[PDB]
Structures are given as structure tokens and as C-alpha cells.
Write a protein that binds this ligand. Structure first.
Ligand code: HEM
Length: 184
């Protein structure tokens, strides 16, 4: 069973306006499938209004040199640092090229945020059942190292940063304009 991790604790009192703004780059990631060894880069632009999150997602497969673009939309939980979204597929210009498949969703939890850093966890689900999960360290700057608060959050749940894949040395290609222009 590709079971999602337990003990994923949403940050208490996340500053919403701060987190749900601008562009976040993944700097480190830990796919919980040890055989998922394809190198990836990721960036996203999450926005929130009225209790609904609308975000633009960008992945880049370093192995295959193929990128894919998604948008996700879903309700923010009352705790303010977790949301479950449905997603579609779009092209670089924002047009839908594949509609949302109802049977798929994902759940994002913001575990910690400090200064220019954040730590999130994503659980992918098919029909409300776990199909896989990933932790990611985020930063406003592609090359930056995480704040110590991020490490403390990882240690609370027996993870260490060395187990994460480090992005900065890979041949990432980003579409920063797709994200910068999100909702403009
Ligand atoms: C907010 C954070 C993230 C969200 C919401 C997210 C969302 C998604 C979604 C919806 C898919 C499925 C796309 C599809 O099958 O059509 C996907 C696939 C995938 N994502 Fe993420 N992702 C996030 C972060 C990351 C990060 C940080 C990495 C690694 C650096 C990553 C690696 C992957 C991989 C390896 C796949 C499988 C792609 C394939 O089938 O070729 N994701 N992600």
C-alpha cells in the first residue's frame, strides 16, 4: 500500500497572506517511494481567497526534459494550513489541455514556514485513497538553504534533511513567467 505518512502536523497559525503569495521553489524533496528516482524540479504559486485555494503548479522531469503544468483548486481547512484540491492540466499559456479527473485529488499540508523557507507535505489520492506522498522544502530563492525551524520540524517526526534529494545541482528548467503571471 502506497500509504501516506502519518504525523503530518499543520503549522499552527500560518500567516495566510504571506504563504499564499508569490512563487515557491522546491529546494529539497523526499518522495516516500524509494524507487521514485527520476530527478525532478518543482515550483508553484498558491493563492487563497474566501477559504478556497487556487494554485498554479509546475513540474519538470530532469530525466526526460519534459515539463508539465497544472492548476489545483480546493477548500482550505479550518486550521488554515491544509487543503485538498482537484487539479486539471494546462499549457504554458494557462489554457486547459486536460480537464480535472474527478477521481483524483491531492492534499497539501504546510508543516512549517519561517523567513523565506517552508516545509510542505503532499498526499496524492485516487477515490479518497492514498496513492503516494512527498515532503518538500520550499524557498523563495532556488539556491537557498532552509531555515533551522524547517530542520526542527523534520526532526520532530524523525526525518533528517540528508535523506532529501537536493535540486540546485540539477539541470532544472523553470517556467517562472507562468507562475509570476498567475491570476494577473
Ligand atoms: C504543492 C506541492 C505539489 C503538488 C500540489 C503536486 C501535484 C502533483 C500532481 C497533481 C501530480 C499528478 C499529475 C498527473 O498525473 O497528471 C503530480 C505528479 C508528480 N509530482 Fe508533484 N506536486 C507537488 C510537489 C512536487 C515536488 C516538490 C516534486 C519533486 C521535486 C514532485 C514530483 C512529482 C512526480 C515525480 C510526479 C509523477 C509525474 C509523472 O507521472 O510523470 N511533486 N504532482
Amino acid at each position: 500500500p502506497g500509504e501516506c505518512s502519518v504525523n503530518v502536523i499543520p503549522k499552527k497559525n500560518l500567516d495566510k497572506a504571506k504563504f499564499f503569495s508569490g512563487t515557491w521553489y522546491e529546494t529539497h524533496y523526499l518522495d516516500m517511494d524509494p524507487q521514485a528516482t527520476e530527478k525532478f524540479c518543482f515550483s508553484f504559486a498558491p493563492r487563497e481567497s474566501g477559504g478556497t485555494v487556487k494554485e498554479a503548479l509546475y513540474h519538470f522531469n530532469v530525466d526526460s526534459k519534459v515539463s508539465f503544468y497544472n492548476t489545483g483548486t480546493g477548500p482550505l481547512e479550518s486550521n488554515g494550513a491544509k487543503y485538498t484540491a482537484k487539479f486539471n492540466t494546462v499549457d504554458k499559456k494557462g489554457k486547459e489541455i486536460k480537464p480535472a479527473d474527478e477521481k483524483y485529488s491531492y492534499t497539501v499540508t504546510v508543516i512549517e514556514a519561517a523567513k523565506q523557507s517552508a516545509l510542505i507535505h503532499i498526499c496524492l489520492q485516487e477515490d479518497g485513497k492514498d496513492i503516494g506522498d512527498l515532503y518538500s522544502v520550499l524557498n523563495r530563492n532556488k539556491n537557498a538553504l532552509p531555515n533551522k525551524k524547517i530542520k526542527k520540524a523534520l526532526n520532530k517526526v524523525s526525518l533528517v534533511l540528508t535523506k532529501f534529494v537536493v535540486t540546485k545541482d540539477l539541470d532544472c528548467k523553470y517556467d517562472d513567467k507562468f507562475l509570476s503571471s498567475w491570476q494577473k
